[PDB]
Amino acid sequence: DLDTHFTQYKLARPYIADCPNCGHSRCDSPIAIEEVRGDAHAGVIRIQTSAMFGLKTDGVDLAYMSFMNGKTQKSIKIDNLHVRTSAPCSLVSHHGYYILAQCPPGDTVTVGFHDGPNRHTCTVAHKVEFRPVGREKYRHPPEHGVELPCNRYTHKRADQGHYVEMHQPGLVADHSLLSIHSAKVKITVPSGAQVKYYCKCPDVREGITSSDHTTTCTDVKQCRAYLIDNKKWVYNSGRLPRGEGDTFKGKLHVPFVPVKAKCIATLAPEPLVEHKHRTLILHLHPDHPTLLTTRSLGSDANPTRQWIERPTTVNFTVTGEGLEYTWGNHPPKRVWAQESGE
Amino acid sequence: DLDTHFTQYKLARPYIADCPNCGHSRCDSPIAIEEVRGDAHAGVIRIQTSAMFGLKTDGVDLAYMSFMNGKTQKSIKIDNLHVRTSAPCSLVSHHGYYILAQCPPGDTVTVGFHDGPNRHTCTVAHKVEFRPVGREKYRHPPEHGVELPCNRYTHKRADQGHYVEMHQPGLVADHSLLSIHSAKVKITVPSGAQVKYYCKCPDVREGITSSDHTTTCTDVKQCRAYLIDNKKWVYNSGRLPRGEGDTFKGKLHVPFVPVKAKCIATLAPEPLVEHKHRTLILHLHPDHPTLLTTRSLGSDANPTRQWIERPTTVNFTVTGEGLEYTWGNHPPKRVWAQESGE
Amino acid sequence: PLNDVAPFGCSIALEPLRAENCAVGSIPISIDIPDAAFTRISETPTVSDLECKITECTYASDFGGIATVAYKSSKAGNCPIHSPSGVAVIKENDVTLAESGSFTFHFSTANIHPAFKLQVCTSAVTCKGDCKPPKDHIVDYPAQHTESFT
Amino acid sequence: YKTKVPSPVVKCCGATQCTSKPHPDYQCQVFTGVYPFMWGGAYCFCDTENTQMSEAYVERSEECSIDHAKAYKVHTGTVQAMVNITYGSVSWRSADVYVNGETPAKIGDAKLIIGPLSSAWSPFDNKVVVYGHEVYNYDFPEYGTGKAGSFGDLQSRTSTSNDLYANTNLKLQRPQAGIVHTPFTQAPSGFERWKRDKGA
């Protein structure tokens, strides 16, 4: 059932916005990255391109690829997507404007497909990290260890847990329109779309037309090449110009809700328990920085906290009634230290 | 002489195991990464894929590529291998199940080729570093500097210094077998291979057969789709199910032995020697963190150690008989400080 | 977190916002038993003219303390037991009895010279003796919980 | 070390009791309650009687042959020298000698007796660890004892010696969510540290 979210698919178009460091510098990429969310734990980021990949223009195959080239879409194959950061990421799934991808940490986020003639990427700043949930501060999820309640995004699309406003596009520039009528500047239209037109000189002042000419002005560089083409709504990017007329409809879901997955998760190597008189020597040797902590169960709590990444023999003045001990997200231990001094 | 290790080549197959974060999550990749060894110094890691690249199925060209697709191999070209970490690594050489690749440090290890229709990668956690041998703590090998005895793996294959056990595979699942005989669940066989079969209901209880049917059960999901196909041994991965019958033969070498190469190696910029009365002022200015240390040659040793990465003017109370001075793996200096106070 | 920094021994849940298992202080508890559950006194064996002694008292938490009791019964059957003194905590609630046999029980104490009464179904006895310290103290929480001046 | 895991057993319906094989630090623990996804989804048709027996032993790395610390009990022995004498008009002898005060060395023409020296400070301590070229006068714990993580978690008599002592605290855990693999939870070696938290 890839055919349950024609809310977005039929009605939304691949938006194009201003990528900030688009290979060279600020281009206008269709895959302009907004709303980077390195807020989960599972090595995953949910991203929004302004491009709406997924099904085609019409009806088929999530795994195809529709961005904007020109005023027009290009609903073709996804062949060579690349999200990346400090390292190349791993795609997880796309739906709508939105992609989920398993990334490592990275100061930035750097996205891009390959149309085939050109690289045509888009890149952005965003502070990314991946702490796993647990008192172990890994840099990456392992193959083993305990499972425990992480925060993470779904693989799936059949999703309604939230919805973001997606009303119309405003106009857009297209000076490919403003040709010349052998002495006058000549506007045309896409398909009968609504072209909003006048020039610095006095001539036609609104523009809701088929292909007009321009009686007064001559220069292409002093005219209103506009495309009110609101047959398909958009995401309400900050890098969108408002459609000044109205808040049109187009409430549209988000696929990648943050969910309470139990990540395959961390585990720190077991401790070396060593006895002394009402005292735990613990030669200790972790894999990664591990937050150890305890609770001397007297009404005097006297707890301790210390991230341990360097192997360290530590000590704990255990009392008569007991202490507990938390080697990372490994479960909490407990200890009777009554006498040992005879 | 690529034709001297048919121990592995003829007799071992490209094993398939469970990659831990296979792009999305835990897949079963043929290139499932076990035994990451970031234990040498030269920017190099020796890795084992469960896939056996090298020669083809039969006899030719180390630089071809045989992984498992289906129950079957696919002995084709290596075209677009990618080992990588925090950055993309550099391949060094492959032999058997095993690849050597020059990597930078990385919290993880992330491997993958490109079959051509699909990325089809595999990734894993492993703490990696590359200290070069020397009192300089670089992050990377330079072009120049002194040579000194590092630990490192070979380029080559003509190698016997160790051998790992490689006995049979256990069975594997293949529910492509369990078709339907228009009302009954229908097992088949690869090539006359040994299919180990029964269902939750009572029917044929061992299965050592050609294509059988199933009188009793009907559902594919309650039957034993197994492949005892022990015509080619495997690596004894932890992600292997035991071949329950026996410890078959198949002792098989390792190519990439750790050897006593002299890495092209580190060197720290020369010191600025400055005289004082029985005292070495040393304005000092390294490239990287350099472990300096000394030995006041009296029977009172009074040594000193400090990693220096930040440029620092230091001091050394030299005695009458002498001191020595070790600017990184730059050779040890020595100094007469008799009087200078007249 | 408070399940890692609290005092007096608590655990926590995002559930009704409980703080489980907070071991602190005492609770004045009172029960009304069903009188049907009682056995009348003339049906349990009278055990007096007995003798009690430790045999290997373990000065410890786990029920290492033991003591034979020269049971001197009248009838034969069960006999509930308890040390009304809190010095000794006993693993056995009830001991079976033949006609004046002997049956060891297990317990734990905190005073080197455990002079605790034992009430074997209306027959008191001092199980005086001496105890030995153990060696092996790294596992969960005790059954003794009776530390005082010793 | 190298946790060179032998490939676990997976009995599909019922238990497989493990035995304590004589491999060094042969850690093995039976496990039930699996559903092992192996290339076709799961393959064992039961759901709790699916049994998985993980086994892992410790073994010398391939680097153990070549990149390896090396303990010693160090006594005093006997000191030497390539004493040159460009003697008299002889003008040359560069001979290797001893210190023990009755040894001559008639190399050249002169007979020469040296020592014993009075300065018996062996800079080596009694117990020494040795690594490639960097020599550490370290109180290595002993063969047969070294606490896991601490130096000498692996302790082989020599490189050839198949027997050893591997206190690595190797503890297998059950594989997750019905998938084939082998959780080996282990201290990285006290040879891993001792190379970057060592002494000078």
Q: Are A297 and C8 in contact (CB under 8 A)?
A: yes
Residue A334 to residue C141, Cβ atoms within 8 A = yes
Helices (H) and strands (E) in chain C, counts: 1, 9
Which phi and psi (to 5°) does residue C41 adopt? -70, -25
Q: Are D1 and D34 in contact (CB under 8 A)?
A: no
Which phi and psi (to 5°) does residue B169 adopt? -85, 150
Residue A43 to residue B23, Cβ atoms within 8 A = no
Helices within D34-118 (DSSP H only): none
- Min Cα distance B332 → chain A (Å) is 30
To which residue do tokens 């006359």 refer? B192
Q: How far apart are CA A312 and CA A314, in angstroms?
A: 6
Using only C-alpha atoms, what is the Rg of chain D? Answer: 28
Instruction: Give the residue among A312, A280, A316 at the shortest CA–CA distance from A295.
Output: A316
Residue B20 to residue A264, Cβ atoms within 8 A = yes
Q: Which residues of A touch D171 (CB under 8 A)?
A: 270
- The DSSP result for A71-130, as a single string, is TEEEEEE-TT-EEESSSB-EEEEEETTEEEEE---EEEEEEE---SS---EEEEEEEE--
Strands C131-132 vs C51-58: parallel, antiparallel or unpaired = parallel
Q: Measured between CB atoms, which of D7, D39, D63 is closest to B173?
A: D39
Reported structure resolution in angstroms:
6.6
Q: How far apart are CA D64 and CA D12, in angstroms?
A: 38
Q: Please name the amino acid found at residue A147.
A: E
Q: Please name the amino acid found at residue A233.
A: W
Q: How far apart are CA B196 and CA D12, in angstroms?
A: 12
Mention every residue, 6+ apart, whose C-beta is less than 8 A from residue A289: A136, A137, A307, A308, A309
Residue B239 to residue D66, Cβ atoms within 8 A = no
Q: Are B33 and B47 in contact (CB under 8 A)?
A: yes
Find the closest chain C residue to A329 by CA distance: C4
Q: Which of A89, A92, A140, A263 to mutate to test the interface with B (most CBs of B within 10 A)?
A: A140
Residue A264 to residue D188, Cβ atoms within 8 A = no
Residue D147 to residue A272, Cβ atoms within 8 A = yes
Q: Which two tokens stand for residue B242?
A: 């035991």
Give all strands of the β-sheet with B98-102 in edge-to-edge order.
B33-37, B44-49, B98-102, B90-95
Q: Using a CB–CB cutoff of 8 Å, tell me whether B110 touches chain A.
A: yes
Residue B242 to residue D39, Cβ atoms within 8 A = no
Rounded to 5°, angle at Cα A300 from A295 and A302: 45
Q: How far apart are CA B96 and CA B46, in angstroms?
A: 12
Q: Which two tokens stand for residue C20?
A: 């489980």
Subunits next to B (3 or more Cβ pairs <8 Å) are A, D
Give me the half-sphere count of Cα atoms (radius 13 Å) on the Cβ side of residue D19.
2
SS (H, E, C) chain B: CCCCCHHHHCCECCCCCCCCCECCECCCCCCCEEEEECCCCCCEEEEEECCCCECCCCCCCCCEEEEEECCEEEEEECCCCEEECCCECEEEEEECCEEEEECCCEEEEEEECCCCCCCCEEEEEEEECCCCCCCECCCCCCCCCCEEECCEECCCCCCCCCEEECCCCCCCECCCCCEECCCCEECCCCCCCECCCCECCCCCCCCCCCCCCCCCCCCHHHECCECECCCCECCCCCCCCCCCCCCCCCEEECCCCEECCEEECCCCCCCEEEEECCEEEEEECCCCCEEEEECCCCCCCCCEEEEECCCEEEEEECCCCCEEECCCCCCCEEECCCCCCC
Q: Which two tokens stand for residue D10?
A: 């997976």
* Cα–Cα distance list, B28 to A218, B64, B70, D180 (Å): 65, 22, 11, 10
- Min Cα distance D3 → chain A (Å) is 14
Q: Which residues of C touch A297 (CB under 8 A)?
A: 7-9, 23
